[PDB]
Amino acid sequence: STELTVQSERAFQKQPHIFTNPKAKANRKTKRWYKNVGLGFKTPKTAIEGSYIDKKCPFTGLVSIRGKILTGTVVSTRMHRTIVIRRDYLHYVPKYNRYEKRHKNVPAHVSPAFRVQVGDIVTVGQCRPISKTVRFNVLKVASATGKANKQFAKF
Amino acid sequence: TRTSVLADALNAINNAEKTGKRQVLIRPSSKVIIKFLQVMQKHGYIGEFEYIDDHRSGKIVVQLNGRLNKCGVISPRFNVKIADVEKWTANLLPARQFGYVILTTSAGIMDHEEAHRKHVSGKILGFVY
């Protein structure tokens, strides 16, 4: 779901105010800026050496992670550059002393540095309002597959 | 299907006590049944039981002495906060001088008085008196 071209749209895609000097003869790939979101969260090497842009990247973009940290399960990875996470919980009805299974759908913005798919449990972090509904940035794909790490059977 | 095995065990104990017998044969014989009968032994409501290995869930043979009058599980193992222990004892036990709400705390399966002594509480298993 990611275009091969590093910039695909009409506007140019650059990290604002990080400049690579063309007159210089170092001729490294580019000058890519990055940061660590803290909380003992490892920045992915796919973001470290990657070539995407993703204005709203917790690791490379301007957005900062602060506030709530929510763990959930991916219910929809199939809309562009964003994720829909199913968070399940038990509401405690006290008149019966009984619990009640309930679910909420939290939109978030997964960076291209992560490879997500339906069913992955994801640790996500609070940030600024990114869109009308997304307020969280995907920070870790804990379960990449879960039960699909081993697929084939060849003794 | 057998959902709550301890329920079957305590029902068998109750039936074989009401008829006046002194022994029970409980078939499935889980951990929880062993701990429950061990607590009853510690408090005297039961006699000398026995685990019979079958390599398949085992079984238990329970000896009684007529001292017990009713077992019983609280089938939904309600989360019992330390404040709600007294309410359960009032609603279940017949008198404050005796009876024991056997409940499973993180410190093991224990009678309600012992749990109150440890100042710890968890889910409720059943009641004996």
Partner: protein, 151 residues
Amino acid sequence: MGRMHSKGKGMSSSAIPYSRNAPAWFKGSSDGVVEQIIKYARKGLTPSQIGVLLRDAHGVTQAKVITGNKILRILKSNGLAPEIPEDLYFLIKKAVSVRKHLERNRKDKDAKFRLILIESRIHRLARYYRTVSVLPPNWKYESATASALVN
């Protein structure tokens, strides 16, 4: 005594002997028993028939007692486990047989209900074999797929 899809209450079964280890009187070799299992599987026999052959014609009480592994486990270790599990395959065969009987005579409604029952059982077993990932997640049951798998 449940009888998932009927009102039966039977308990006719077999009681596995208490002793897990090999019987005292058995003189055969575990490696020879494994070789026999392999040969029977190569003949084109499902694990249940392999077990019945080992119990009847030979002194093998059960494979796990003698070798330490189960029959299907032994076959899988040697890569002879069928792509469809035996019970599901037999359910598929039964379902296709009843569907053939139905399409050869429409008015029989009792066999229609029995086909519904068999299809429900097939769906349940397929769901189980799918959550354990024995079958691919896209595996399913429709018409003309049962015939293809059976044939």
